[PDB]
Amino acid sequence: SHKEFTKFCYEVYNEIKISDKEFKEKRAALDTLRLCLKRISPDAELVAFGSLESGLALKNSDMDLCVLMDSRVQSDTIALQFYEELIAEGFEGAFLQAARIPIIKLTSDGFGASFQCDIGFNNRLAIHNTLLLSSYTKLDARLKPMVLLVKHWAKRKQINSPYFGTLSSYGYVLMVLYYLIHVIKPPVFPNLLLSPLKQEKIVDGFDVGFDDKLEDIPPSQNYSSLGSLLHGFFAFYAYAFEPREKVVTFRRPDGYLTKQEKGWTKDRYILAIEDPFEISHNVGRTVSSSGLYRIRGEFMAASRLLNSRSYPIPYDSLFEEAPI
């Protein structure tokens, strides 16, 4: 049970994870942008966040960067100077000024036409979200391949499109973490936000505090295989999770929170996933009725495949490209 599925899981993981060549290319891109920035403003710094930073990136990943500056200095000149410099160094793309905040979206140039890099300014909340995810990936070796396999599945099944009514990759990562912390028994992970060792840390009006002294955390008491974990994850969201009523949350000791209790009955609450630090944000706000239908449909198809009576089980079907 799951030994063969586990073998398959790791094989796929090693095929879909970002290659050493691509990683050093992305690192080389980051070093260039940091150079460009250093000449515009020595005191500022360029921080990477998201998948590339936390080690949860698939092949051909895009970049997500953040520029940090003192709050007294009006960004306008620095962000636009940086954009001008990047255009001069061969990148192409957009500068967007929207609601008093600037964003850079680079689209071309290694690094080629393959290049897609989003640059924000003083997006500290995203940095802290990534720090939490990075911490969990350091705590247990099973998490990185589990996340990559789920992201790969969601992309292949066309349920990873927040603009077409389904769910962001970050959403799926939080669904995985919720399952590993609050559903599976024994837990794979403790809840680092609710730990007695957690200290309040207020950043931009939110508490981003969590227990980050990972060295002192004992080994997981869950000894199940990657295959077993995945099998469990698909079954939970296929059958047990009740999206009409319940909220995926990192703020309850037992993981129990209803939409009514939360007060989450164009932001949708069809699928409700409470962001662990920015708790007023529903990461699932992009999911529509038809989108949830397809997401639930694919969880059931995945779970049914993994429990097939027919041998041998066509495990490759799990990552088979869906129509539409």
Numbering used by the authors: 40 to 148, 152 to 307, 321 to 379
Cite, word for word, the article reporting this structure:
One such TUT family member, Cid1 from Schizosaccharomyces pombe, is a now well-characterized TUT, which was first demonstrated to be localized to the cytoplasm and to possess poly(A) polymerase activity in vitro, but more recently has been shown to possess TUT or poly(U) polymerase activity, in vitro and in vivo. The TUTactivity of Cid1 has been shown to be important in promoting mRNA degradation of polyadenylated and 3′ trimmed transcripts mediated by Lsm1–7 and the exonuclease Dis3l2 (12,13). Cid1 has been extensively characterized both structurally and biochemically, revealing that a single histidine (H336) in the nucleotide recognition motif (NRM) is predominantly responsible for discriminating uracil over other bases via a mechanism that was proposed to involve two alternative conformations of the H336 side chain. We used an RNA-binding-defective mutant of Cid1 (K133A/R137A/R277A/K282A) to improve the resolution of our crystal diffraction for higher resolution studies.
We have successfully improved the resolution of diffraction of our crystals, resulting in a higher resolution (1.74 Å) crystal structure of Cid1. The structure determined to 1.74 Å contains two molecules in the asymmetric unit with one chain exhibiting a typical Apo conformation and the other having a significantly different conformation. In one of the molecules in the asymmetric unit of our high resolution structure (chain A), presented here, we observe that indeed H336 adopts two conformations via a 180° rotation about the χ2 bond. Unexpectedly, this H336 flipping occurs as a result of a double conformation of the D330 side chain, which was clearly visible in the unbiased electron density. Therefore, the H336 flipping previously reported, which was inferred by analysis of the refined structure, has now been observed directly and can be explained by the hydrogen bonding network with D330 and several water molecules. Of the two molecules in the asymmetric unit of the high resolution crystal structure described in this paper, it was clear from the excellent quality unbiased electron density that the NTD of chain B had adopted an unusual conformation. This conformation is related to one seen in our previous report but the mutant enzyme used for this study is trapped in an intermediate stage compared to the previous closed form. Dyndom analysis indicates a pivot point for the domain motion of this ‘intermediate’ structure as residues 163–172, supporting the idea that there is an inherent flexibility within the enzyme between the two domains and that there is a single hinge point about which it occurs. We analysed the volume of the catalytic cleft of Cid1 and its intermediate closed conformer using 3V, and found that in a native open conformation the catalytic cleft volume accessible by solvent is 3339Å3 whereas the NTD rotation reduces the volume of the catalytic cleft by approximately a factor of 10 (336 Å3).
